[PDB]
Amino acid sequence: PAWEIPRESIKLVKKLGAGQFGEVWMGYYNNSTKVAVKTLKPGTMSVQAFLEEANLMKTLQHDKLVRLYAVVTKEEPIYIITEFMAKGSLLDFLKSDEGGKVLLPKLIDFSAQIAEGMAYIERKNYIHRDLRAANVLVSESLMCKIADFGLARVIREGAKFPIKWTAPEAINFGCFTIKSNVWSFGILLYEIVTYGKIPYPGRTNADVMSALSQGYRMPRMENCPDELYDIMKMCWKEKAEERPTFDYLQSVLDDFY
Ligand SMILES: Nc1ncnc2c1ncn2[C@@H]1O[C@H](COP(=O)(O)OP(=O)(O)NP(=O)(O)O)[C@@H](O)[C@H]1O
Predict the structure, then answer these.
(1) What angle do CA 120, 36, 63 make, to 5 degrees?
(2) How many CA atoms lie within 13 A of 126 on its CB side?
(3) Helix residue ranges, H only, 76-128
(4) How far is CA 147 from CA 93, 101, 234, in A?
(5) How does DSSP assign 17-86, residue by residue?
(6) Hey, which of 17, 21, 46, 199 would disulfide with 164, CB 3.0 to 4.6 Å?
(7) Domain 1-84, CATH
(8) CATH level 3 topology of 85-257
(9) Which residues carry out catalysis?
(10) Does the beta carbon of 16 lie inside 6 Å of ligand 1?
(11) Annotated binding residue 22
(12) Is there a contact between 81 and 10 (Cβ–Cβ < 8 Å)?
């Protein structure tokens, strides 16, 4: 398309992450613009499967969603070039010394920002399926954007749904809808309020999907206001239909203060 750029017009500077499917690098699109470069380790994923994430992003363009800038697909090492987010994932940020110092007001902000990005995704008739703090990125101005549309569909090779973030009807019946993303959002609120703690501490994945089939919900966590817990408990309603829309969450969270 007009998304292709020559390999020469990007310089990779610092390595950010590893993984089985390739690497992520900080870089520059012809010197001028700071970018993130996702690298495919040839042989691992299919090239078509690796680019499905990019193909998806071509359609998904909103401020609270990491934007795609371009791709390099003509030559063996395939690149996905996206907007650089200075503070990394929300998970890592929340756990850093700096993030440990961010008070509850700005946590509700982060949370409301993601609800905004998700409200676009549901308005666009899409599902994300992989919504969690590790898949949300933070800019220098402390803006949150949704990332990682590897599992996002218009309503898989590699690819593992996040069991501990996935709605019970999605696990047990394979029923992924925007309402299952609302479930995931509730867990993402848990991650925010606890500064990046793992869901269901000390519970294996199997324990969790068994516990959920018995109506387990995480009890009110320390340093979480009734009102914020009621938002979580709203996302964790058994019947998917009875869970609120993202447009509602963005409203209720935004006026939280
Ligand atoms: N746009 C970006 N700006 C800055 N850092 C990023 C960006 N995208 C990814 N990273 C970092 O690179 C790492 C991997 O990113 P991610 O998009 O999760 O790749 P992945 O292979 O899909 N998932 P994982 O294997 O769990 O890291 C994370 O630790 C992020 O901190």
Answers:
(1) 20
(2) 20
(3) 90-95, 104-123
(4) 15, 24, 24
(5) E--TTEEEEEEEETTTEEEEEEEE-TTSS-HHHHHHHHHHHTT---TTBPPEEEEE-SSSS-EEEEE--T
(6) 199
(7) 3.30.200.20
(8) Transferase(Phosphotransferase); domain 1 (1.10.510)
(9) 130
(10) yes
(11) yes
(12) yes
* Number of neighbouring beta carbons within 10 Å of residue 185: 27
Residues of CATH 1.10.510.10 domain(s) within the chain?
Answer: 85-257
Ligand 1 near 85 CB (within 6 A): yes
For residues 34 and 27, what is the distance between their CA atoms, to the nearest angstrom?
6
The two tokens of residue 227 are 């009102």
Cβ of 91 less than 6 Å from ligand 1: no
What was the structure determination method? X-ray
Report the distance separating Cα 50 and Cα 66, nearest Å.
Answer: 17
115: which residues sit within 8 A by CB, 6+ positions away? 185, 246, 249, 250, 253
What residue's CA is closest to ligand 1, atom 31? 88
> Which residue type is seen at 76?
E
Per the structure block, which two tokens stand in for 173? 């019946």
Fill in the amino acid letter for 211.
Answer: A
In one letter, which amino acid is 185? F
Cα-based distances in Å from 7 to 12, 37, 75, 76, 208: 10, 11, 8, 11, 45
Contact 246, 178 (CB under 8 A): yes
Q: How many whole angstroms separate alpha carbon 124 and alpha carbon 136?
A: 19
58 CB neighbour count, 10 Å cutoff: 11
CA 15 / ligand 1 centre spacing (Å): 11
